[PDB]
Structure formats: C-alpha cells, structure tokens
TrEMBL record:
The protein's name in its UniProt record: Calcium-dependent protein kinase 1
Record keyword Kinase present: yes
Subunit structure: Monomer.
Main location (coarse class): membrane
Localisation per UniProt entry: Cell membrane; Cell projection, Cilium, Flagellum; Host cell membrane; Parasitophorous vacuole membrane
Residues of the whole record sequence present: 72 to 340 of 537
Positions of the Protein kinase domain: 5-251
Binding site for ATP: 35
Similarity field: Belongs to the protein kinase superfamily. Ser/Thr protein kinase family. CDPK subfamily.
GO molecular function, one term: protein serine/threonine kinase activity
One GO cellular component, as annotated: symbiont-containing vacuole membrane
Amino acid sequence: LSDRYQRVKKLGSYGEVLLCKDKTGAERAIKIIKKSSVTTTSNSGALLDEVAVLKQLDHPNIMKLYEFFEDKRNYYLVMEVYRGGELFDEIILRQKFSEVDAAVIMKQVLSGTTYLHKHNIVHRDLKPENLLLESKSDALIKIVDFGLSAHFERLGTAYYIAPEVLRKKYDEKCDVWSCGVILYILLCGYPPFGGQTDQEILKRVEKGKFSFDPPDWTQVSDEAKQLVKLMLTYEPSKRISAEEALNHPWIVKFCSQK
C-alpha cells in the first residue's frame, strides 16, 4: 500500500483521492475506499469481474483505471492523473456558465456516458463532483466512479437522483436525468429541484416539476430549454438516451461555434 506509491498531494474527499508517484515513475490518482465507510451490495467475486471490464475501458472522457488493490482495510483504485479538480469547483468559481462553455462540457459528459452505456455500465451517481478536469486549461472532462454504484448521501446526491432510483426500478436512463440536472445547474447556477434538507429535495424530484424562471432563464436559448426538458422527462421510456442528447441541436449548435 505505502511501499509502491509516494504521496505528492491530496486531490479530493467513497473516500480520499491522492496524487501519487510510482516508486515506472509515472504519476497516478489513487482513490482510497475504506471498507467501513461503504455498505457492500454484491458478492466478493462480482467486484473483481467488473474491475476486469473497467480496466479495458478506453475513452477521452472516462478516467482510465490501471490497478485495483486490496488489503484488510481499504480498496485501492489506481487511475490516471488529473490536476484540474472537479466540475463542482468550477461551478463555485463561475456560478453559471455560458451556453458555449456548457455545451462543450456537456458534449464530453454525454460522450463518456454514451460510451459507458454501450458496455452496459450505468453510473447512477453522476454529479459535478464525479466530473473531473484533466488539467488547468482545453482540459478534458473525465467521468469517475462509474461501476461503483452496482457494488457499494449527505454530499448532495439527492439533487441529481432520478425518480426511478427512488422507486427502486432504474436502468441507463437515470444517467440522462442526472446529466439534465447538471446542465440545468450549469445554465442558471441553481438546481431544478432544490430544498434546505434532503427530504424536501427528494419530494420535489418525485413530483418531477421544475421551471425556467426569470431572470436567469430569460436569455438562455430555446434549444437549451428543449434539451433540459427532454433530459428531465419523468417517464424513463420517453426520456431521450445519452446518444440522442449528444446529437441534440443545442450540442451541435454551440459545439460547432454558434
């Protein structure tokens, strides 16, 4: 655990993420997951089988997984380096994003999500914290923590959860909903389903009602509102896929420079 890698700095806080050097001399981001902090939802042979698949994943908008270690105390996930923090940080800094910058981000989020769905992987926990920036530039958005929801709350996860997950009957479409909530936040600076406590947030999510209220939504393009509506459609069967969202006029418009 401590013999193989040398800590450079802490990156984030499932558990803690550290920037480490290989004592190869490449730099890696290592997630330390404490056994006590998580409740297991699968058997011992199911996680190792998924790891074998997660190591094979190769996409510009998906965190590469190199190694998976175990001891009596922790799970160790050795990933590629990231130096630009999380999207969550940028949301605090910028408050709201321009439609061009939001589309650039969302194209990447949807590209990665589409790729994950093509291999029967649903994230279920998509949020700005799980959307990482490669560097401090141009920098690629990379999805992290995929494939973990199938094996293992006060971190504001209620905002992004699809109503079907609450009904305990979900598929890949729950990721599109989460992506819609993220997009909504990027455009105006606040969640579509808010509240002071998790309980009143989840009730608004269950109701499914949201608004494009002034003055924050007034100048937002019509195709942006159209996409948010399609991603936040209550019926998951009627909800557009990640690929459809990626191909939507709003993405196509603002990512071809309009």
